Amino acid sequence: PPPIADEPLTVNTGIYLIECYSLDDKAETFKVNAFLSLSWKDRRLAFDPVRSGVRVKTYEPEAIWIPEIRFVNVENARDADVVDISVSPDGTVQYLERFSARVLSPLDFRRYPFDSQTLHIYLIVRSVDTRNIVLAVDLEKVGKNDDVFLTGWDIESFTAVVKPANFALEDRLESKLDYQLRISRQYFSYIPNIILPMLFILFISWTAFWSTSYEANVTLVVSTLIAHIAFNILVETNLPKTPYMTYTGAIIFMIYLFYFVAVIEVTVQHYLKVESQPARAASITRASRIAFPVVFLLANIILAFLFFGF
Amino acid sequence: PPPIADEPLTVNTGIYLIECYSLDDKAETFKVNAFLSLSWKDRRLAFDPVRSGVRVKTYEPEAIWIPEIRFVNVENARDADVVDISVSPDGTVQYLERFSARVLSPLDFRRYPFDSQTLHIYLIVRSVDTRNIVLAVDLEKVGKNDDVFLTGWDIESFTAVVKPANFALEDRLESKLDYQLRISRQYFSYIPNIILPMLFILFISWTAFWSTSYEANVTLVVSTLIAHIAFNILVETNLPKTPYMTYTGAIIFMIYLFYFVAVIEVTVQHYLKVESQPARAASITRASRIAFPVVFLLANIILAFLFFGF
Amino acid sequence: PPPIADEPLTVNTGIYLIECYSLDDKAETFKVNAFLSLSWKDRRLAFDPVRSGVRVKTYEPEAIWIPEIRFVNVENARDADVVDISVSPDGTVQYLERFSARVLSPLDFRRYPFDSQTLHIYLIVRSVDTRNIVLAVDLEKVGKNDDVFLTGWDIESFTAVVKPANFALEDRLESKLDYQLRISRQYFSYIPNIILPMLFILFISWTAFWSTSYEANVTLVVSTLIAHIAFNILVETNLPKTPYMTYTGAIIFMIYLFYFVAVIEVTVQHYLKVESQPARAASITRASRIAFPVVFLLANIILAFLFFGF
Amino acid sequence: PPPIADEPLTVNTGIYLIECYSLDDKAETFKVNAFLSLSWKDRRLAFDPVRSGVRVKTYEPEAIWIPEIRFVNVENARDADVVDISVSPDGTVQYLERFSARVLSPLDFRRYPFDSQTLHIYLIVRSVDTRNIVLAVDLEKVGKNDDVFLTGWDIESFTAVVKPANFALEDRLESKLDYQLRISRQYFSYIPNIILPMLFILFISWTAFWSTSYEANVTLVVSTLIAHIAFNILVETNLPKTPYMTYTGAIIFMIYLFYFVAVIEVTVQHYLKVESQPARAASITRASRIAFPVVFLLANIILAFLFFGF
Amino acid sequence: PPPIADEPLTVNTGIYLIECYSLDDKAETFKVNAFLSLSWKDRRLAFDPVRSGVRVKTYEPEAIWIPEIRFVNVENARDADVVDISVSPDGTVQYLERFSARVLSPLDFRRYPFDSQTLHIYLIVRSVDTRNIVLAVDLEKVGKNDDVFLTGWDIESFTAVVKPANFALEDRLESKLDYQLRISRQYFSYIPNIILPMLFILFISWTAFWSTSYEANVTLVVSTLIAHIAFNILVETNLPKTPYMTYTGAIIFMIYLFYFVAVIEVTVQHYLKVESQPARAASITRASRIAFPVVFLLANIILAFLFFGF
C-alpha cells in the first residue's frame, strides 16, 4: 500500500556503523553491524496532534507501508532487527533498524603491505507506480562510533555520495547510494615478521662472496633460498590471486633473482678456480661483494619508486 | 490454484547477475547474487483498467498463484527475497525476486593456469495439470552488471540457451533452462609466484653440470628438488583431485624427472671419476650442460603443444 | 489427525539425487540435494471425481495429515521445501519435497588412495496409534541424475534396501530404510602428486650407495628424509585419525625404515672405513645397492598383497 | 498456565543420544543429537477415557503448559523439534522432542594421547509459584544407540546422576541434572604418525656418537632437531593451551633436552679433539653411546610413571 | 505501550554468566551464555492481591510492555529465550531471559603470553517519551558460576560499573551500562612449547663459538635460524596484527639478531683465518662465547624490564 504522491518520493537514508570486523583480504569482504535510518512523507497517515493521542505515533512495520531498501553488494539477505518506527504529525515516518551483514567490496593490493582501501555499501530501491529516489540525511550518517574496530586497519573516514545513481533496471527505475568506508592498513607487523626476516636471509645468502668453499657456499646460498620460499609461501597465502602485480610480490620475486645470480657466481667462482685461473675467480667474488647489494638497493629504489612514487 | 489454460503455459524467465564471487576451484562451486524475472498470463485475474484502480495491480505472493521455479544445481534452497509483483490488465503477471545461492557447476582444469570456464545455472519447473514450459525473456537476461566481480577471473559473457529441455521426471514433465556464464582465468600471478620460481630452482639444479664436487653437487641437485616439492605441494593444494591430467601437473611432474636424471648424472660423474676414467666423466658432464636444457625446452614444446595446440 | 486404518499403514518412499558434493574425508560427511517422494492411502479424503472438481486435488501441507519422515544420520534438521501434494480419488496422497542436508556416513580408509565407498541415507518414522511401515517405490528412487557430481569420486550406483528395519524405540515402533550410494575414489592425482614424488626422493636417498663422502651422504640421505615428512604430513592432513592402518600410511611408514637403515649403512660405511678396514665397507655399500631396492619392491609386493590381495 | 499442585512438581527427564560427533579438542566442545523425554502430572487435564475420545489425547505444545527445560552448558539455544505430546487419563503428560545442540564440556589432557574423558549435559529448570524438581526416568535415558559414532573415541557409558542439584538462583530455585558421557580416546594413530616417527629422528640424532666429523655431526644432530619442531608444532596445534602439563608435552619437551646435550657432546668432542687431547674425546663420545639411550629410557620410565603410575 | 510515569523510569539490570567459552585472540571476541535480569515499576498493572488471583501474576511477553535492552558490542542480535515474567502487586515487573551471544571486546597483547584482560558487555536502551535509565541490581549480577570455564584463562572477577553512561544519540537519549569480565591468561603451556624450545635452538646456534669448521658452523648457525622461523611463524599465527609491539614479538625478534651477529662471527672467524691471522680469529670466537649469552640475558633483563617493570 504505497504512499500516494504527486512526484518521485524521496526516502532519506543513513548508516551508523556500530561494529566493524572480519575484513577478509582473501575473500574481499568485511562484516559490518550498523543502524539503518530511513524516512519519508506518507501524508496518508498524518494525525491531528491535539485531536488524538500524542506528539508522535508508534507503529509496527506491518501497519505502515515501508520501502524495500536492499543492500546491493551483500552475500546474503542483510540481517536486520527493527529498532523503532515513529510517524510524525505531517505524515512523516521515522524508521530505524539495526542490521548486520557481510559486505562484498573489492580491494587493491597493488601496494599490498602499504595499501589504503575504500570499502562500499550500496542500498538500491526499486519503484512501483510512484518512483523512488533515495538520498542521505547526514545526521544519521555520522555513522561510525569512536569504538569502530577493524583489526589491523586504521579507519580514516565514513562518508557517502550525496547524489544517488538512478538506473533503469528491467522497466522499473532503481536508485542506488554509495556509502564509503576509507581505511589504511596497519603495515608494521609486516616488518619484524616478514620484511626484516626476509632481508636478513638474503644477506646471509651472499655472505658466500667472502667464502671459497663451494661445499659451504651451496650449503649457504641454497639453504637461504629455501627460507625465502617459506616467506614467499607465507605471504602468498594471506593474499588473493591478483591478475596484476603486488608490491611485496615484486620484491619477493625480485629477490628470487638475487639468489639465482648469487648461485651463478658461487658456481662460476669454481669452474674457474678448478680451471687453474683463480686470477679471475677471486676477482669476480670480490666484485659481487659490491655489485649485488648495490644492484639490489638500486633495484629497490627503482622498484619502490615504480609503485609508490608514480 | 494454477491458471486454467488451453495449452502448456509458458513462464518467461531472466537473470540479472548483481554480484559474483567466491569461485571455489577445490569445491567446484561459486556464489551468485542476481535478479530472477518470471512472467506468465493468468487471464484469471485480468482487471478492467478503467472500471477499477489503475494501470497495474500489486499483489503479495500469497494472493497470486506463482510457479515453483527451483534452481537445479544448487547446494541448498536458493535464498530469495521478493522485489515486486505486478499484474497487468490482460491477466499478465510480472514477478521479480532477488535470490542469492551458491551454484555447483564443474570446471575443466585440463589447461589449469590457462583455462577458460563455462558455469551453469539451471531453473527447472515441474507441472501439475497444465504443463509448464519455461522460456527466456532477453531484456531481463542482460543480467550481469558492469561491476560483476569474480576475483581472479575475466568474465566473458552471460548468455542463455533459448530452447528449454523438457524431460519426463516421475510421471510429471519438467522444463529446464540453461544459463551460461563464460569466464577465462587470470593466469599471471601464477608466473612470478609459481612458474618462474619453479623454473629458477630447476636451473640452479643443473648448475652442477659445471661442478665436480659430489659433496656440493648433491647439496645442489638435492636441495633444489626439495623446493620443487614446496611448489608441487603448494599447487596441488589449491586444486581438486582431477581423474585426468592437469597442464601444470604435467610440467610440475615432467620436472620431477629432470631432477632424477640430473641426480643420475652427478652420481655417475663420480663412480666414473673414482674409477680413474675421468676421460668419460667430464665428457658426460660436458654433454649434460646441453642435453638437459634442450630436452627440457624440447619436451615443453612437445608438452605445451600436446595440451593447447591440439 | 492421522489416517484411520485397519492395519499398519505403509508410506512409500523415494529419493532422486539432484546434486551431490562436498564429500569430506576428514569429517566423514557429504552433502546431498535430492527429491523426497512419499505416498500413502488416506481414504479419509477420497473425493468423487465426477461429483466435484477434477482428476486430482492439490493440498497445502497444513490441510492433509503428513507422516513425519526424519532422516537418521544427519547433522541438523534436513532442509526441505515442498514441491507438490496431490491427493488421488481413492484417498491416495502424492507428496514431493526437495530437501538438502549434509549426511553423516562413515568411510573405510583401509585402502585409502584406492578405496571404494558405500554412503548411507536413512529415513526413520515413528508411530502413533496406527503403526507406520515405510517402504520404497522404485520409480521415484531411480534418484540420481546423469549429472551427479561428487568431485574426485566415480559414482557407481544409487540403490536401496527394499526391506525396512522396524525397531522398538521407546514404547513406539519406528521403521528405517537404507538408501545406498556406492562410490569409488579417483585415485590418480595421488600419483604425480604423492606416490611418484614420494618414490623419487626415496631413490635419490639411496644414491648414497654409490658414494663414499660421509659429508655428502648425510647431506644426501638426511635431506631426502625431511622431504618425506613433507609428504607424510601432507597426506596425514587430508585424512582422519583411523584407529586402524591405512594403505598409504603403511607404505609411507615402511618408507620411514628404508631411511633409517639407509642412514645406518652410510654411517657404518665409515666407522668401518676409518677403521682401516675398507675391505668390508665397500663390500657392504656394494651390497646395499641391491638389498635395498629389492627388499623394498619385495616388501611392497608383500605389503600391497597384504591389503588388496586378501 | 502452570499445573496447580500441592507440592514441588516433579518433571521426569531422559536423553536418547541418536548421533554424536565433532568432538573438538581445541574448543572443548562436542555436538550431540538426541531425544529429550519430559513427563509430569497435570491433573488439570485428566479426561474420562470412556466418556470421551480414546486412551490418550494428543496436544500441540501451545495447548498444554510445558516446563522450560534449558540445557546449561550449551553454546546457543538448543535446537529442538517436537516429536509427540501424549496426555494420559490421570492428567499425565508425555513429551518428546529431538534436539541437537553443541555442548561445552571440559576435557583433561593430562594424559593426552592416552586420556579418558567424561562429558556433561545439564538441563536446569527454573520455578514459578510451584517449585520444579527435575528427575531421571531410566527407560528414556538408555539413550545412546548401537551406532553412536564420535570419531577417534571409544564410548564407554551414557549414565546420569539420579539426584538433582537444586540451587537458589535469583530468588527462584532451579533444579539441575547431570548427564554423563564417558569416553576413552583411540590413541594409536598417534604412534605410526607421531610417537614412532618422533623417536626415530631422536635415534638418528645420536648416531653422531659413532662419528667424528663435526661437519657431519652438526649436519646430523641439528637436522633432526628441526624435524622434532615439525612434530612439536604438529602436536601443539591440535591441542589447547592447558595451564598444566600434558604427557606428550612432557616427553616432547624432555626430548628437546636430549638434543641439547647431544649437541653439547658433539661440540665438546671437538674443542677437545682440536685440543690435542683425543684421549678424552673418544672416551666421552664412547660413553654417550650408552648414557643417552639409558638416561632417556630411564627418564621415560620416570616420566611415564609420574603421569599414569600415580 | 510504555509505562506512564512522572520521571525517567529506571530499569534494573543483572547478568548471571552461566557459560563462558571460545575466547578468540585473533578475532578479539568471546562467547557468553548468561541470564539477563530486568525489572521496572509499571504501576499500570498493579493488581489487588486479595481481590484477585495470587501473590504475583505471570505474563507472556506480548501482554506486558517490555524495555528494548540491546547489547552494544555484539556481532549479531543477541540470542535469548525468556525464562519467566512475574508482575508484583505494586506494578513491579520481574523479567528473566537466558541469552547467548558472541561479544566483541578488544584485548591488549602488549604482554602477550603474560597478559591479563578486561572483557566488556554493554546493554544500551533507547528512550521514547519517558526517558529510560538503566541501573544494576547486584543480587542478579553475582552472575558467574563456580563452573565458569574459559579455557586457557584464569577468571578473576565479574563486576559492573554501577553508574550508567547516558548519551544523546539521534535526538533520543540512551543509557549504557558496563559489565566487566577480568581474566588473566594461563601462560605456561607457552614455555615447554614455545619459550623453552625457542631458547634451546638459540643456544645450539652459538655452539659454533667452540667450533672452527665453517662448513659445520653454517650447517650449525643456519639450521637453527630456520627452526626459529618455525617458531616465529607458529606464534605469529595465533595472534592478530597489533599496530604495537608484543612482548614475545620483541624477544622473538631480538632473537633474530643474535643469529645475524652469530652468523657474522662464524663468517669473520674465517676471512680472518684464511687471512693467515688466526691470531685474531680464535681471539674473537673466544670472546663471543661470553659477549653473546651475556648481551642476551642482559638485553632480556633490559627488554623484560621495559615491558613489565614499567
Ligand SMILES: [As]
Ligand atoms: As640442509
